[PDB]
Structure formats: C-alpha cells, structure tokens
Point group: C3
Chain length 200, copies 3
C-alpha cells in the first residue's frame, strides 16, 4: 500500500495501470500523434506542440518528427535542442537534457528497466531511474541510454553506443557497452574530422 | 520441381513475386497502415486490428504503434505480450513468441536473410528460418534477432544485442554478437537493479 | 570563411540556415511526408514520389515506407534498389548507392557529423562527407554508416555494425566498430546460411 507514483520516485518496483497514469499517457500520446502526423509545412503547429508535449523546453528547440515517449511531461529539455528523426524517450520518470544538445537519428533513452528474474516481473513490473544529459552533449545514431545514467557535459557518444554507466564530461565514449574512448584535448580544436584541419 | 511456397518451408532460397505472396503482403500492410496511423484513442479498433494482423494472439496483448512486418500472418503470439514502439518483424516465415514476453522499443526480428554471395542473390534471393522466443523473455532496446534463432524461456537479452546464435533458457545474454553473460540465479529473486532488494 | 554551399563541397564546417537550404529541405520533407503517409494500395503514387524524392533512381527501385532523409535530392540510386522499413539518410551532401543494393530494415546513413569539441559546434556546426555504396552490397539491420565511408562492391555488412571506416569489396564486415570478418570465397557459392548447401 504505497501509491505507484510514490514507488517510482523511490526506485521501487511498480506498475502503471492506475492512479491517473493511463490518463496522463493518453494526453501526452495524443499530442505526440498530432505532432508525428503534422505536415512539414505546419511549422507554428509543430512549434507549439513541442512547448506543449514536454514539461520543459528552452528556446530554439527543434525535433524532427517522429518522436516517441510514454508521457512527455517528464522530459525537461534545455536551450537550443536539436533532435533528429525517431528520438524515443521512455519517460516514466525524470529525463533531463541540458543546453545545446544535439541528438542524431534513432536514439533511445529509457529510465525504465525490468527485473531480470522473470518472477519479479510476472505482471511486467518495472523500476525507473532518471537520466541526465549534460550541456553541449552530442549523441550519435542508434545510441541507447539506460536507466539512471548521467552523461557529463560537453561529452560525445558514438553511434551504436549502449550507455549503461555514467559518462564523465569532456570525453568521447563508444562501444557496447559504452566506454570512455578518450578525453577531448586541444587537438580537437584543430582537427574536426579524421584528417581534416580546421584551417584549410 | 518445387514452388517458392515449398522452398520457404524447406529452408531453400526463394523470391516472393509470385504465388500470391505479394497479394498476401498487401493485405497485411494494409491493416498495418491502419494500425500505425490510428489515433491513440481508437482503443477498441487497435485491439481488433491486432487479432486481425497476426496469425495468433493470446489474451492481453499490447503493441505500441508503429509496428512493421511483412505479412503479419506468419507471427504467432502467446498471452500477456507487450511490445513497445517500433517493433519490426520480418516474417517471410513463421515467428513464434511465448507468454509474458516483453519487448523494449526499436527491436527488429528477422527470419529472413540473403546469401552472402552476391552471385546467389542476383535477383535478391533469400532464405527463411523461423524464430522461436520462449516464455517470460525480456528483450532490450535496439536488439536484432537473426534467422532461425531460438531464445530459451526466462532469458534476458540486453539492449543492442545482435543475436545470431540460439540463447539457452534462464540466462542473461548481451553483446555484439550476443554472448551468454551469466545464469539467472536466486540472487536475482531479491535484487533487480544494482543493489536494490525487495521486502515483504 | 566562404559561402555555405561551398564549405559543404569542400568538407568544411558549416551551418545550414541560409542560401535556400531550409526551403530545399521543406520540399524534401514534403514529398517525404506524402510518401510516408501514402496508403499501401496507392502503388502508382508511391512510384512517382520515389522518382521525385531522390536525385537519381535507376529502374526497379523499391522503398518500403517510412523513409527518412534531410533533403532527398542529394541521393543517387542505381538500379534494383531495395530498402525495407525505416531507412534514414542524412543527405546533407551526396550519397551514392550502386546497383542491386539490398537494405534491411532500420538502417541509418549519415554523411554528416559534428566537431567533437563543443567550442567547434556552439551553433551546431557540422561537416559532410559523401558516402559511396558499391553494387550488390547488402546491409543488415540496425547498421549505421558514418560520414565519408565507401562500401566496396559485393560486400556485406552484418546486422548492427557501426561502419566508421571504408570496407573493401568482396568482404563480410560486422561489429562495433565494423571490421572485416573474412573475404567472400567460393564456399559461399554453395553454402548460403549457417550449414545449408544449394544441391544435396
Ligand atoms: C565518435 C566519432 C565522432 C569518432 O571519434 P574520433 O576521436 O574523432 O574518431 P577516431 O576514429 O579517432 O576514434 C578512434 C578509434 O575508435 C573507434 N570508434 C570511433 N567511433 C566509434 C563508435 N561509434 N563505436 C565504436 N568504436 C568507434 C575507431 O574505429 C578507432 O579505432 P582504432 O582505435 O582501432 O583505430 C565517430 O565514430 C562517430 O560515431 N560519429 C557519429 C556520427 C553520427 O552519428 N552523426 C549523425 C549526424 S547528426
Ligand atoms: C541487460 C541489463 C539488464 C544488464 O544485465 P545485469 O546483469 O543486471 O547488469 P550488469 O551491469 O551486472 O552486467 C555485467 C557486465 O555486462 C555489461 N553489459 C550489460 N548490459 C550490456 C549490454 N546490453 N550490452 C553489452 N554489455 C552489457 C555491463 O556493462 C557489465 O560490464 P563489466 O562486466 O565490465 O563490469 C542492462 O544492460 C540492459 O540492457 N537493460 C535494458 C534496459 C532497457 O532496454 N529498458 C527499456 C524497457 S521498456
Ligand atoms: C553477416 C552474416 C550474413 C553472417 O556472415 P557469415 O559468414 O555467413 O556468418 P558467420 O557466422 O560465419 O560469421 C562468423 C563470425 O562472425 C560473427 N558475426 C556474424 N554476423 C555478425 C554481425 N552482424 N555482427 C557481429 N559479429 C557477427 C559470428 O557470430 C561468428 O562468430 P565466431 O567467429 O566467434 O564463430 C549475418 O551475420 C548477418 O548479419 N545477416 C544479416 C541478417 C539481416 O539483417 N537480414 C535481414 C534481410 S531482409
């Protein structure tokens, strides 16, 4: 006897078929549908749905439909946020993105997991831990960010990464599981790609 | 002497632009279309389309649109099935899923593949080997399951896994390619995440 | 610096909010919307759009909706092209696909990337390097192909690989990051999958 809602915040196992959760979900997923199916020319429309879908959205935010979430109202986005096609966020709990964050296509964030033992999840039980994307972070394509992960500022996450651990700031991380490939140093102020110098 | 119908069943190479296959594909993608572009409030309709779309569906099935498949009628689902956003199932041949199966967002299932040799696929020839998912299986995000793969009951597939070989029951598997990581023991019956236990 | 469209062609850092780039994108995303939302029965309309969406498309092209791209007009496709669901192509610059190329579902092609050093991207500045996919290439599901990569003729990219470097022709590459597994020999002329021969 503890409201599901309060079990989420406590990191306890819960289910979401009650206490107004389903109604919340239908509100968000309703806005999601008119965004996702809006005509590319309906820019103002899209512009308001964004402010509308997420609990928090800074200025100069852009999201290439389609976009997917469970609620929408648990996603708090910062300034100048760009997200490319198919950004999926399972926001059963807090998801926070800093400023000037760039998100490539087909990225997946999820504060939710299921107990490994199929007996702790007989009724699709879940747990939720907040994700936190720092400022000036860049996430490559097909990246997956798992429950309770924090990505430090100005860091980069390579395409295909499966982030399962916290990622410090100022690094470059990649792999399955995602691991720190390396620190970003002055050479990166000159070389922006493979063998290409900033001064051509 | 053997139709393409019999070739698929036999595991032999084939092509699907005859024997009514194309027309079969159209019927399924038509219901698929209606399902994928349905309003979140069209609850009844969504439920009826599901029992329509797939060959078999057990009680309490839930698929979060959009869903993608080739025929849909080659897929058999057990009971209490929950698939999140963008489940993709290339079912040129039979796909069987058990009960209490949980599928995270952006998961691709595929019974189909193509000869490695470009000489064998001059006309895009393929082979199809059924996929079999046990009961109480949980599949992480961005996981891909290749042709003829069998996942043993109660097993867990970590996010981003690329499954090319059969997974035994009662295991936690992950990686690229997927490798059995450990056995699911009774220590999992208390712990569900890092160091979070369960009390009375 | 110098004009934005030039920086592109020169592999220099650029932003795309001028020189008519946004409008160019709107026509693209417009034809894209018309394609993605078409009905499975509207085959003739789907074919006109294919020819209209991309710069060049050889005969026999088939693209299963939905398909995603930035401009569309920066894509050149050969002949007997086949792409399954959710092909995403960030064609900020040229993307060339040869003949008899088969693409599995959920593949992402991006000629664009961002300077890893945040100071070099304050205004989400990016670079773009063409992508060249040879003839008779087969790309598996959930593959990601990064900027300026060349996939040789007759090669195969396993499901889930993250292709960061060029792939030689006649090989089988897979992995994160993608690495050459072996060369396509003549045994591949008999065995097409795990242990199945052609005549026996
Ligand atoms: C992360 C990235 C920018 C490269 O990091 P970088 O330091 O400048 O690149 P490097 O090639 O020097 O990386 C060094 C090593 O890491 C490997 N590596 C790079 N990216 C990797 C990735 N995503 N996953 C795994 N390994 C990766 C390289 O293959 C290389 O191998 P080696 O050490 O054996 O030689 C690039 O790999 C990438 O993924 N970009 C994302 C592109 C994208 O998704 N764009 C979308 C546009 S919005
Ligand atoms: C599979 C999963 C549950 C972890 O298994 P677990 O046994 O409880 O986790 P562990 O951290 O103890 O795993 C042990 C090792 O495997 C690695 N690992 C875990 N998941 C991995 C994955 N998906 N791919 C590759 N490696 C993985 C860990 O990084 C760790 O590395 P180490 O041995 O060097 O220390 C987790 O990785 C995962 O993928 N969860 C899915 C969440 C999700 O998709 N939720 C959405 C539901 S709607
Ligand atoms: C690439 C592919 C055809 C297999 O290559 P193949 O030579 O005939 O297969 P093999 O099993 O002999 O490959 C050898 C090794 O590479 C590994 N491997 C195969 N595919 C891999 C992949 N995609 N990523 C990483 N490793 C892979 C195998 O696990 C194996 O491991 P081992 O050397 O320890 O034994 C297959 O893995 C694949 O990815 N097919 C794509 C299927 C798909 O997406 N189809 C949809 C089409 S509509």
């Amino acid at each position: 006897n503890m409201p599901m809602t309060e079990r989420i915040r406590a990191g306890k196992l819960f289910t979401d078929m009650c206490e107004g959760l389903p109604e919340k979900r239908l509100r968000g997923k309703t806005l999601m549908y008119e965004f996702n199916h809006s005509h590319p020319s309906e820019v103002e429309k899209r512009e308001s749905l964004i402010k509308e879908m997420f609990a928090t959205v800074g200025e100069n935010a852009w999201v290439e439909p389609p976009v997917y979430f469970s609620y929408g109202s648990n996603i708090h986005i910062g300034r100048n946020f760009y997200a490319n096609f198919n950004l999926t966020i399972v926001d059963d709990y807090t998801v926070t993105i800093g400023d000037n964050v760039l998100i490539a296509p087909n990225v997946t964030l999820s504060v939710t997991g299921h107990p490994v033992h199929h007996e702790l999840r007989k009724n699709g039980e879940m747990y939720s831990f907040p994700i936190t994307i720092g400022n000036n972070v860049w996430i490559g394509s097909h990246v997956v960010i798992n429950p309770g992960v924090t990505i430090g500022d100005n860091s980069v996450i390579g395409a295909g990464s499966i982030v399962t651990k916290d990622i410090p700031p100022n690094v470059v991380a990649a792999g399955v599981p995602c691991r720190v490939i390396r620190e970003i140093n002055d050479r990166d102020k000159h070389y922006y790609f493979k063998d290409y110098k900033v001064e051509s």
